[PDB]
Design a binder for these strands. Sequence first.
RNA 1: GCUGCAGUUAAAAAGCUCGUAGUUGGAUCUUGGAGGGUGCGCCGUCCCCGCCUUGCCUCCGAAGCGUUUACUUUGAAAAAAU
Lengths: 190, 150, 84, 129, 158
Amino acid sequence: SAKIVKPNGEKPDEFESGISQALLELEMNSDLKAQLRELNITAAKEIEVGGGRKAIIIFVPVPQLKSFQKIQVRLVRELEKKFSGKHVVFIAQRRILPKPTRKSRTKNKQKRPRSRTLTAVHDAILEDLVFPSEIVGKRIRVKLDGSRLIKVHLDKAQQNNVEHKVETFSGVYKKLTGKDVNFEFPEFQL
Amino acid sequence: GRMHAPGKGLSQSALPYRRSVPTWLKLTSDDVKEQIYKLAKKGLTPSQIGVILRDSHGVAQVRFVTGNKILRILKSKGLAPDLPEDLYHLIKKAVAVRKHLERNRKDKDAKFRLILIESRIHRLARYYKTKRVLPPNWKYESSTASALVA
Amino acid sequence: MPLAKDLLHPSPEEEKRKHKKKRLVQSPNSYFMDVKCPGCYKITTVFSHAQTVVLCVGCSTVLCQPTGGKARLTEGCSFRRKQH
Amino acid sequence: VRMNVLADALKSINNAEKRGKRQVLIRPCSKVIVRFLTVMMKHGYIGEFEIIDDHRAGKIVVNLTGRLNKCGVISPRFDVQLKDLEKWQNNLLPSRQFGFIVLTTSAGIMDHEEARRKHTGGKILGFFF
Amino acid sequence: MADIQTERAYQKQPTIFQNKKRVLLGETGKEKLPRYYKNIGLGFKTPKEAIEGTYIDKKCPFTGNVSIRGRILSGVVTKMKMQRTIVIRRDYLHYIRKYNRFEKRHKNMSVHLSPCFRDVQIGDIVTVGECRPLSKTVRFNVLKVTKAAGTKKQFQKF
RNA sequence: GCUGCAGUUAAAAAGCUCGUAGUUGGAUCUUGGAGGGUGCGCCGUCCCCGCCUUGCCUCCGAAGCGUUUACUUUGAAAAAAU
């Protein structure tokens, strides 16, 4: 119920409950169970796409992700179908640590890991938002109006799973960072 | 460009972007770490392990299929040897040049070259020492160097 | 240099002619392949330029010799690239 | 080798505009290059720029109009004392009226006008007009 | 430890008296030496060694008769050749306008070092405090040993 | 000749390289409406400020208290004559 899988320091509910139930629904089965069972989730958040189909974002412990990666496509396919009208995906909760000041104080708290920096984390978010494709490259555009836009290049193959999504990834990303993201396709070295 | 000559030559790896992959790469961390350790048993250097792994068996970079550089893998198993390999091959090279110069006292080129090599060694050791790898007070000496490299 | 290129989107053809280090954003110019030799049926992955002898799984065979550059594959052999 | 990276970016720009060029690719970029490119941008001296992400140190493409006579870098990064800023802008700016000295202060990389208004000071990066 | 007392004169803290006495256990009494100490002030913790110790050192800021007043300085330990005293090197920046770059410059400062501090080893950064003339050269006394195994160039342990 | 010099031929790059001191050193770790000064005749113009992750902890003050600095900023302390 709420207790097990919606935990991570808060019980709660509603959607988390629905999705969890959906996972159980999937759980009845074969190899489409036992493999999942281990997987667990911290929380779910829902945020929309501009005309109005919402996207559902799921949070993972991070040690878990390799396994989630293991399934992903098949699971997402199920969650989109059972829960339709939403774009489902998977993001790992990452900690982020503040850069020390100085007088922040500083009781030289244990170093911290780049694998804890806000930029690194955000990069991870970008990496997580798209899936099996791969981010081929990136560029940053400085708009006349002091604005910045990040062009995130994408692979080509197998993309289709993401193609329809793109707009949500942009919106979702915004909700998290407040930065603007855009997507593109390549090229194929020759 | 270059340190002990006027050579310009740009030349390199050119390492790949793609964050992940290879994808056509199955195997596993398990697999190649075993592979690495077994090769290092045989006496192979990390450069050498990386090459042979690269060409014979699928490993584009050992880093990517395992979050660790080959040397770090070796050291963690307990395969790290006494001085870093670059320093080794330098010391060994200055040895072979030194042996050749003892044979042929008439070769001024060789004497020049020996100096160059030796300077490169002393600076490298200064760097390793600054960085704990070598005990502060480490030095390379002709006398003892011969005995050191083998 | 006539005050005309889109340094940001350069052409794939003239990007493909340039040095690996001179490429817009860098990238290599080398690849991997699967290699055959009828007697066996399984397939060894090989690196385009190779230095090492590469021998097959079992048969002391051959499977290219090295050179200045790309390994020269040996006589009666076949090879799909290839991935991403 | 390299001591600074800014000086290269700035020079590269200046030679682009001198040729009659409308774009450049600078390498390798840095937070400081971005910040400087940005101050330039706010003021009009360049168009829009783009940081391309090699898995290395970066490469920037700047699209430039042609309002730029010169963007220089001051090395070393001398300390300036609020009434050495008045002395700097006079040394290296065309008329009292325009052109900016851009420095780095505790409270941000800024053009000296913004410096005067905040009322902070620091070490001098460079300039343009 | 090493027998302190070593010299020819009986080392003692002034006006801190004894009197051992008869009856059983101890025997006399167990500590056998009353010890007097004080905190320097300025929030410098008086290290345990001072309180725990047998050593005499009049010159000690914690155990001895010296007051710390005046400049509080920090420097890097260049020498620990002399007994109970060290030499520290103080780097400072000299500003030259006439055209403007100033050039690193340094001064060495002799400073007394209480036996309470140990591992005073060259390389260690140390915080010394001004004091009454201890010796013709020495104006200062080591108040705090800043330390660090860090500076990694080796790996310190505990 | 710092600002602000010249050194192919005018006065001036050591025959060449190694090299300690000294100097000099790549990218990369925080983000995404009104208060106060002086001009112009109740109106406004133009700075400056907290805003539309930002010292932790001890448990408002106090205290703990600073990771070190340089830097720069705001104060005091700053002989009169000049």
